[PDB]
Scaffold this motif. Structure first.
Motif, PDB file in Angstrom:
ATOM      1  N   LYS A  56       0.848  -1.175   0.000  1.00 33.36           N
ATOM      2  CA  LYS A  56       0.000   0.000   0.000  1.00 33.36           C
ATOM      3  C   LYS A  56       0.888   1.231   0.000  1.00 33.36           C
ATOM      4  CE  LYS A  56      -3.933   1.859   2.582  1.00 33.36           C
ATOM      5  NZ  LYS A  56      -3.284   3.087   3.097  1.00 33.36           N
ATOM      6  N   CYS A  57       0.466   2.259  -0.724  1.00 34.14           N
ATOM      7  CA  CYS A  57       1.305   3.441  -0.887  1.00 34.14           C
ATOM      8  C   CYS A  57       1.323   4.176   0.442  1.00 34.14           C
ATOM      9  CB  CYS A  57       0.790   4.325  -2.012  1.00 34.14           C
ATOM     10  SG  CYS A  57       1.485   5.978  -1.991  1.00 34.14           S
ATOM     11  N   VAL A  58       2.376   3.956   1.221  1.00 35.67           N
ATOM     12  CA  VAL A  58       2.439   4.406   2.602  1.00 35.67           C
ATOM     13  C   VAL A  58       3.678   5.260   2.801  1.00 35.67           C
ATOM     14  CG1 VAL A  58       1.222   2.367   3.326  1.00 35.67           C
ATOM     15  CG2 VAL A  58       3.660   2.386   3.411  1.00 35.67           C
ATOM     16  N   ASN A  59       3.504   6.388   3.469  1.00 36.61           N
ATOM     17  CA  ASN A  59       4.638   7.217   3.832  1.00 36.61           C
ATOM     18  C   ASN A  59       5.396   6.531   4.957  1.00 36.61           C
ATOM     19  OD1 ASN A  59       6.169   9.287   5.292  1.00 36.61           O
ATOM     20  ND2 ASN A  59       5.177  10.721   3.881  1.00 36.61           N
ATOM     21  N   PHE A  60       6.703   6.359   4.783  1.00 34.10           N
ATOM     22  CA  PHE A  60       7.478   5.520   5.686  1.00 34.10           C
ATOM     23  C   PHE A  60       8.699   6.277   6.168  1.00 34.10           C
ATOM     24  CE2 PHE A  60       9.585   5.061   1.743  1.00 34.10           C
ATOM     25  CZ  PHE A  60      10.902   4.853   2.045  1.00 34.10           C
ATOM     26  N   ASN A  61       9.103   6.013   7.404  1.00 27.65           N
ATOM     27  CA  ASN A  61      10.337   6.549   7.959  1.00 27.65           C
ATOM     28  C   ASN A  61      11.013   5.444   8.761  1.00 27.65           C
ATOM     29  OD1 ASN A  61      12.126   8.852   9.121  1.00 27.65           O
ATOM     30  ND2 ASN A  61      11.233   7.829  10.894  1.00 27.65           N
ATOM     31  N   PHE A  62      12.076   4.865   8.208  1.00 29.06           N
ATOM     32  CA  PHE A  62      12.714   3.667   8.750  1.00 29.06           C
ATOM     33  C   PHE A  62      14.041   4.065   9.373  1.00 29.06           C
ATOM     34  CE2 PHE A  62      10.831  -0.365   6.994  1.00 29.06           C
ATOM     35  CZ  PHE A  62       9.591   0.194   6.865  1.00 29.06           C
ATOM     36  N   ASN A  63      14.232   3.736  10.649  1.00 24.24           N
ATOM     37  CA  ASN A  63      15.411   4.186  11.385  1.00 24.24           C
ATOM     38  C   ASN A  63      15.574   5.687  11.241  1.00 24.24           C
ATOM     39  OD1 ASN A  63      16.594   1.922  12.694  1.00 24.24           O
ATOM     40  ND2 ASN A  63      17.220   1.163  10.683  1.00 24.24           N
ATOM     41  N   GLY A  64      14.464   6.360  10.983  1.00 25.40           N
ATOM     42  CA  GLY A  64      14.528   7.741  10.604  1.00 25.40           C
ATOM     43  C   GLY A  64      15.022   7.998   9.199  1.00 25.40           C
ATOM     44  N   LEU A  65      14.877   7.007   8.314  1.00 24.27           N
ATOM     45  CA  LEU A  65      15.288   7.167   6.895  1.00 24.27           C
ATOM     46  C   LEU A  65      14.327   8.165   6.241  1.00 24.27           C
ATOM     47  CD1 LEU A  65      15.830   4.312   4.275  1.00 24.27           C
ATOM     48  CD2 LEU A  65      15.478   6.757   3.894  1.00 24.27           C
ATOM     49  N   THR A  66      13.019   7.870   6.329  1.00 24.52           N
ATOM     50  CA  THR A  66      11.854   8.669   5.836  1.00 24.52           C
ATOM     51  C   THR A  66      11.607   8.440   4.334  1.00 24.52           C
ATOM     52  OG1 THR A  66      10.518  10.429   6.777  1.00 24.52           O
ATOM     53  CG2 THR A  66      12.339  11.155   5.382  1.00 24.52           C
ATOM     54  N   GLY A  67      10.514   8.995   3.801  1.00 28.25           N
ATOM     55  CA  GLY A  67      10.200   8.853   2.367  1.00 28.25           C
ATOM     56  C   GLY A  67       8.825   8.255   2.122  1.00 28.25           C
TER      57      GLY A  67
END
Lengths: 48, 49
Positions: free
Chosen positions: B4-15
Protein backbone atom coordinates in the motif's frame (compact mmCIF):
# COMPACT_ATOMS: atom_id res chain seq x y z
CA UNK A 1 26.34 19.89 -6.17
CA UNK A 2 27.83 21.54 -3.11
CA UNK A 3 24.93 20.84 -0.75
CA UNK A 4 24.97 18.83 2.44
CA UNK A 5 23.28 15.78 0.93
CA UNK A 6 22.32 14.61 -2.54
CA UNK A 7 19.07 13.21 -1.15
CA UNK A 8 16.41 15.89 -1.18
CA UNK A 9 14.40 14.30 1.62
CA UNK A 10 17.38 14.19 3.97
CA UNK A 11 17.77 17.96 3.66
CA UNK A 12 14.06 18.47 4.24
CA UNK A 13 14.02 16.09 7.19
CA UNK A 14 16.92 17.55 9.14
CA UNK A 15 17.00 21.33 8.61
CA UNK A 16 13.94 23.58 8.44
CA UNK A 17 13.13 26.01 5.59
CA UNK A 18 15.08 29.17 6.53
CA UNK A 19 18.40 27.39 6.10
CA UNK A 20 16.96 24.70 3.82
CA UNK A 21 16.49 27.16 0.97
CA UNK A 22 20.21 27.83 0.65
CA UNK A 23 20.90 24.11 0.46
CA UNK A 24 18.05 23.31 -1.93
CA UNK A 25 18.77 26.23 -4.25
CA UNK A 26 22.09 24.49 -4.84
CA UNK A 27 20.48 21.22 -5.92
CA UNK A 28 17.92 22.95 -8.12
CA UNK A 29 20.70 24.77 -9.93
CA UNK A 30 22.66 21.56 -10.33
CA UNK A 31 19.90 19.13 -11.22
CA UNK A 32 18.31 21.54 -13.67
CA UNK A 33 21.63 22.09 -15.42
CA UNK A 34 21.97 18.35 -15.85
CA UNK A 35 18.42 18.10 -17.14
CA UNK A 36 19.01 20.97 -19.52
CA UNK A 37 22.10 19.36 -21.01
CA UNK A 38 20.38 16.02 -21.54
CA UNK A 39 17.56 17.64 -23.48
CA UNK A 40 19.97 19.59 -25.67
CA UNK A 41 21.72 16.30 -26.32
CA UNK A 42 18.42 14.74 -27.35
CA UNK A 43 17.34 17.61 -29.58
CA UNK A 44 20.61 17.46 -31.46
CA UNK A 45 20.55 13.68 -31.67
CA UNK A 46 16.93 13.66 -32.79
CA UNK A 47 17.99 16.01 -35.56
CA UNK A 48 20.56 13.44 -36.65
CA UNK B 1 1.52 -2.14 6.50
CA UNK B 2 2.46 -3.69 3.17
CA UNK B 3 1.44 -3.47 -0.49
CA UNK B 4 0.00 0.00 0.00
CA UNK B 5 1.31 3.44 -0.89
CA UNK B 6 2.44 4.41 2.60
CA UNK B 7 4.64 7.22 3.83
CA UNK B 8 7.48 5.52 5.69
CA UNK B 9 10.34 6.55 7.96
CA UNK B 10 12.71 3.67 8.75
CA UNK B 11 15.41 4.19 11.39
CA UNK B 12 14.53 7.74 10.60
CA UNK B 13 15.29 7.17 6.90
CA UNK B 14 11.85 8.67 5.84
CA UNK B 15 10.20 8.85 2.37
CA UNK B 16 7.20 7.56 0.40
CA UNK B 17 6.89 4.19 -1.30
CA UNK B 18 4.94 0.96 -1.44
CA UNK B 19 6.26 -1.47 1.16
CA UNK B 20 6.42 -5.00 -0.21
CA UNK B 21 8.26 -8.14 0.78
CA UNK B 22 11.52 -8.62 -1.10
CA UNK B 23 12.87 -12.03 -2.05
CA UNK B 24 16.37 -10.56 -2.31
CA UNK B 25 18.62 -11.84 0.45
CA UNK B 26 20.78 -9.44 2.43
CA UNK B 27 24.07 -10.56 3.82
CA UNK B 28 23.71 -10.47 7.62
CA UNK B 29 25.65 -7.25 8.14
CA UNK B 30 24.09 -5.21 5.32
CA UNK B 31 21.28 -2.91 6.32
CA UNK B 32 20.12 -0.64 3.48
CA UNK B 33 19.75 -1.67 -0.12
CA UNK B 34 20.45 0.57 -3.08
CA UNK B 35 19.81 0.85 -6.79
CA UNK B 36 21.89 1.16 -9.97
CA UNK B 37 21.17 4.88 -9.64
CA UNK B 38 22.03 4.79 -5.92
CA UNK B 39 18.50 5.32 -4.62
CA UNK B 40 17.01 3.45 -1.67
CA UNK B 41 15.11 0.41 -2.91
CA UNK B 42 15.49 -2.27 -0.22
CA UNK B 43 15.36 -1.69 3.53
CA UNK B 44 15.64 -3.85 6.64
CA UNK B 45 12.90 -3.38 9.21
CA UNK B 46 14.61 -2.31 12.46
CA UNK B 47 12.40 -4.09 14.97
CA UNK B 48 12.09 -7.38 13.10
CA UNK B 49 14.86 -8.31 10.68
Amino acid sequence: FGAISSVLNDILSRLDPPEAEVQIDRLITGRLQSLQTYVTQQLIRAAE
Amino acid sequence: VKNKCVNFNFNGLTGTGVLTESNKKFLPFQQFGRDIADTTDAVRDPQTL
